[PDB]
Nucleic acid binder design. Sequence first.
DNA 1: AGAGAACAACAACAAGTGGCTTATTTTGATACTTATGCGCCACTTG
DNA 2: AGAGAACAACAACAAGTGGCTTATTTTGATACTTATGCGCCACTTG
DNA 3: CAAGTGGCGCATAAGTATCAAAATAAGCCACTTGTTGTTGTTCTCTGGTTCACGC
DNA 4: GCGTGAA
Lengths: 306, 550
Amino acid sequence: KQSRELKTVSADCKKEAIEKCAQWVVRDCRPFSAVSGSGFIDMIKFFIKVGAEYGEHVNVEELLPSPITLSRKVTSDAKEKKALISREIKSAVEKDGASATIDLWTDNYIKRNFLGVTLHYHENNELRDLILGLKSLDFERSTAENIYKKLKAIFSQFNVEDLSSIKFVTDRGANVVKSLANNIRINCSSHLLSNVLENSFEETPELNMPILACKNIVKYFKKANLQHRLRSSLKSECPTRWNSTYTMLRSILDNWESVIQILSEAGETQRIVHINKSIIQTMVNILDGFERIFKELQTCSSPSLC
Amino acid sequence: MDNLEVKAKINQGLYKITPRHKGTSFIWNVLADIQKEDDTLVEGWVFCRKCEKVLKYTTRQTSNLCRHKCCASLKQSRELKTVSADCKKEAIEKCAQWVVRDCRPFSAVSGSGFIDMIKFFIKVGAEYGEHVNVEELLPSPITLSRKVTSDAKEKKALISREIKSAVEKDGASATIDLWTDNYIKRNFLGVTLHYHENNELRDLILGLKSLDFERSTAENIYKKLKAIFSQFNVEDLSSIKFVTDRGANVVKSLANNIRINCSSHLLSNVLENSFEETPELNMPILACKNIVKYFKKANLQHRLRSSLKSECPTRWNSTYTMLRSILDNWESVIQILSEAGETQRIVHINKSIIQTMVNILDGFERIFKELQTCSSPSLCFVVPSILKVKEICSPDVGDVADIAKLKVNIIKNVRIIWEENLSIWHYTAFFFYPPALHMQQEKVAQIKEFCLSKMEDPVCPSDEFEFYRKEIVILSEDFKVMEWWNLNSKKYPKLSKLALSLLSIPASSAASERTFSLAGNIITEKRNRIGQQTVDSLLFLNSFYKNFCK
DNA sequence: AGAGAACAACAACAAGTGGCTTATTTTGATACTTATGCGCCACTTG
DNA sequence: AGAGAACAACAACAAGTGGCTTATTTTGATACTTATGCGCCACTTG
DNA sequence: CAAGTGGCGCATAAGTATCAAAATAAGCCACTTGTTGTTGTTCTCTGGTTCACGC
DNA sequence: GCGTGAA
Ligand SMILES: [Zn+2]
């Protein structure tokens, strides 16, 4: 028990420590998992070190800065770290090995347009990934020329002048297509397969009718607050998110007994019984195969091109 | 040289002095400057108050001025032992890693609880050296939840005695409300409590318990509130003053007890009725609504210099700030509409009516702000609100006849909505105003026997009531009624408790709105599995720390 | 061839001052870049 | 396809009083050698 | 006379010893409340809004 | 010109 190593404390210290932690958590309205932060324990290390080395009569308030200082410091560190890393960035991109995915996104509240850039490349027995930056296209309407200028500006402030050897795996955005016509443009496999599935469903209206029935049933569930007695609540109807209807099918067919029991006295049981379960499990298995394909192929931490 | 010249002139007395500069540093608490004979400040040089030597002044830097011998001795108040610049550098560095690695807001470091934690941690580190294992010291969130629940239980047990002590003296003002969350569709029941013990009202929440998922009904509300009061072992449940506006099932449940309407939502409904009866002013508001939607649909908000406000969240008439934002930047928006091809929309609206409506609705906003105050008592200034809204809506020739129609609608709605729904308790509260020269009508006639009957539970009550009737002092700008009868409590030992109870009744029930907003802050899209017990415990602890602690 | 004890004529030495060129620090006003800090001021959000 | 956040359900647990036989140090005491001065006091000498 | 020593024990004492009857901790186990810990489950987040444009 | 879609 504490064989002369990094020392422990008594029970009073633990009690008062958790008292202080509870005080902070309840008073400042922060998430509970804060005390498990990776940087939080490092800050605790620094503070206990400083306190031990400088006694217990120091001005705690003065040692802690203001948020504006934090912003200036993080900006300065951003500039310094970018300058430090640009050398290895140019070294890696010079050797024809540099792969980057490009896609734009619109902000939810202010709707400012942005563009993000990352990099996938192999340093030493591993594929190193770091995001290069994320710059906004002001407020002007999006165009291929602006995207091309912004990307060359980012690569240039990171000391890149080739813009030919690097690789892109992106969408079929015609503006993006004309943006980088001098290099390769590879269609996103996930997006291609999503289009394939959309075409697959849309050519069979007879079997699309069960999908409409199921989505209107989950609408009936969410509209009347009927997920309360259900053992496992249902998910979103149609978010256009890589066949969320697959999860809908799994949930519906795992609570089929409960939903039929509920709808027997609800008067809508005639609608569900129109479709037999066998075809439903068959397409569930097909979507199981497709979901396995998704989870194996869609991976940024291991090779998947093979 | 210039300095010798100005020194000689000021010593001869040709130039005068100015000792204070309104600066945040301590150097100007001793240092001073000079002004010329034509009331012009001296630039580039300063003057000391003890050595009487003219030193240089620099706008870009003042460090050279603090090493002077006269200002050296003053320094500043002794502080706890400080460290060098390096330690601060590594401190801000580690704080930068903390704030970047956990996606946390920057203003987290300035929290009071964080300061308490760092004080504790620096103390324990100084006590037990530099080799203490930190990972065992920091607990896990499950322990945090268990301990906060237990602490909520024990704090409630401790305070229930003083809730009883407050309720026995008939001070039992507390409002209830219902609200729906955003993601679980659960319905939560919220209730606060107000009482006076230590010369200001105590704002705290009794609790917030969820009524499961079963269908809303009067019996569920009554049993829920009965249980909530039962955790404090309270069975009176009759002298509690209720403030709910138009909750139909809620009113039906508590119809046996004392019920009082809510003034804020009443006034909002009065404004709604007033604007409903004038279509000529109804369609310009709709035109402004469509104009705002036109900007918002195609994110045309970038061009404008001051973006428009939210349309109408049913959150106390946001159309005020909506029309303010529209009016105060009219030229730019009408230009944008000019090249937008939708120029026909603006023809229906004129600026003068906009500005007059801005004036009157800003008056209504001021009324809202004055009446809605949780900390200070606010029940007294209610009838003067009706008087002021009456006098502002004076039918004149300056306004258009349509504005006269709107004013007539306001007066009709306030006459047939507000005063007929006003309880005698509001009259009693208005009566205690120290200058009572305006009212000598039947209201005092009724309040006489009302107060005499209520206070049943030499030293004659009627005689001291007329003694209060004679004493009259006009209002001062910094006057408070509560401390006024705190001083007069010796003069009237029994009526003081009655007036304290009356002044403990809030004008409205905005406390429930504040609690619901706080709960919405607690429950976010990213935190949704949180339980009702934890929410209630957190809210109770926050309210207790804000109210009853230091 | 010891040994013990004490003057004597010189005689080779220090403790305690001034004179002094010639450096040898200390006190002090001031010309700048450069990393912190309140405080309105929003201000856009729902 | 990671992203944070958080319960419920069952294992798991150090923190604390009470029996207690087995080492073993404090105090105590009798018991006995070495050696260390204090003062008469002769006990001399010149 | 007086500065020097033995002497007569000589009353004292800082040393040593061993013979008893007590004052303590160590290793284990009792056992009863309260108390902390992984390891599961369950609900959202990003996939997306009109322009390059050829067909 | 208007899908044309692939976002
Ligand atoms: Zn001075």
